[PDB]
């Protein structure tokens, strides 16, 4: 039935958020479209935490379609925790109108994590297997009612960081170059699949063997097992800064190795410019350490990603 495009705005390569409207008449929120979770929630008026006061809060009093459902919601994103209550209301994402969509309305958001974040809420795009009890992921409702023309969505993130796009129910050949390589999903919870090897110059330095990796648009870095990451941090030239981090000499870029992920028989290199992030006069390393690899924005900025729920496939194509 439909195709929606949502322009994303980026809080400096760390979050990839967009506008959604909730309630009748609609109230506006900015949300993080999150392929590593499946729950949808926005702050409410019942939330008194400072983070809530520094953001948009849903006022059910002004919505003619709201309906409390009462069921609790606790989501523990390491970073910060969020407590709320489930309810129902209409959501609008571009032109696609998603009626009686369950949505979490925070009640407590303690801590600084959420205060300083640029989004108001999180909209979960992983499998229903991940979603909290009584919560129905937004794409699943869209799908279930033939609201999208195809049961796929597509992520374009711009490295030049200004025309980032989420496309619902469509693939756009103009944001990629070459062909799409379809990779099957091994475990349907996150968007998970099998990487064959991580090599530097024909030498395998991580994931010796095969390893599982998830495609998470809600993680900024490339995250891996710390043994494998440490070796990658030596290999590229990365040192630990006093702050507990890994820095790279910004003027050393030209000589640093390219890192290659071999996914289902194709190679997806990561150039130095691609895994090297520079803010102000200092440069930091893209790779971070936690068994499962998390291919964050570092990889998705380079590879236009299609998430296909009809077929349970990930499709990768080099980003433009």
- Which residues are marked as active site? 34, 216
Residue 188 to residue 14: CA distance in whole angstroms: 26
Residue 293 to residue 113: CA distance in whole angstroms: 23
Cα dihedral: 166, 154, 136, 118 (round 10): -30
Q: How far is CA 68 from CA 23, 42, 71, 99, 245, in A?
A: 13, 14, 8, 14, 44
Residue 200 to residue 204: CA distance in whole angstroms: 6
Q: Could you tell me what percentage of the chain is helix, strand and coil, using 3-state DSSP and rounding each to the nearest 5?
A: 15, 50, 35
Spatial contact of 205 and 258, defined as CB atoms under 8 Å apart: no
Print burial letters for 83-98: b (CB count within 10 Å at least 16), e (below 16): bbbbbebbbbbbebbb
Q: Quick one: how many helices (H) and strands (E) in the chain?
A: 6, 25
């Amino acid at each position: 039935g439909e195709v929606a495009s949502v322009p994303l705005t980026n809080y400096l390569d760390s979050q990839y958020f967009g506008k959604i409207y909730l309630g009748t008449p609609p109230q506006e929120f900015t949300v993080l479209f999150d392929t590593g979770s499946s729950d949808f929630w926005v702050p409410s008026i019942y939330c008194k935490s400072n983070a809530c006061k520094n953001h948009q809060r849903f006022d059910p009093r002004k919505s003619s379609t709201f309906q409390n459902l009462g069921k609790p919601l606790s989501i523990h994103y390491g970073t910060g925790s969020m407590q709320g209550i489930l309810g129902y209301d209409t959501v609008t994402v571009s032109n696609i109108v998603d009626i009686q969509q369950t949505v979490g309305l925070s009640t407590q958001e303690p801590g600084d994590f959420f205060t300083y974040a640029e989004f108001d809420g999180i909209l979960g795009m992983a499998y229903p297997s991940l979603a909290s009890e009584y919560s129905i992921p937004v794409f699943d409702n869209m799908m279930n009612r033939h609201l999208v023309a195809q049961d796929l969505f597509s992520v374009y993130m711009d490295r030049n960081g200004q025309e980032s796009m989420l496309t619902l129910g469509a693939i756009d050949p103009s944001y990629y170059t070459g062909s799409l390589h379809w990779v099957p999903v091994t475990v349907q919870q996150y968007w998970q699949f099998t990487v064959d090897s991580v090599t530097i110059s024909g030498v395998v330095v991580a994931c010796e063997g095969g390893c599982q990796a998830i495609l998470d648009t809600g993680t900024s870095k490339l995250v891996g097992p710390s043994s494998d990451i440490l070796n990658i941090q030596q290999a590229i030239g990365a040192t630990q800064n006093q702050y507990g981090e890994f820095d790279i000499d910004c003027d050393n870029l030209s000589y640093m190795p390219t890192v290659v992920f071999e996914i289902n028989g194709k190679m997806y290199p990561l150039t130095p410019s691609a895994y090297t992030s520079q803010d102000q006069g200092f440069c930091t390393s893209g790779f971070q350490s936690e068994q499962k690899w998390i291919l964050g924005d570092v990889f998705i900025r380079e590879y236009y990603s299609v998430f296909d729920r009809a077929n349970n496939l990930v499709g990768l194509a080099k980003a433009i």
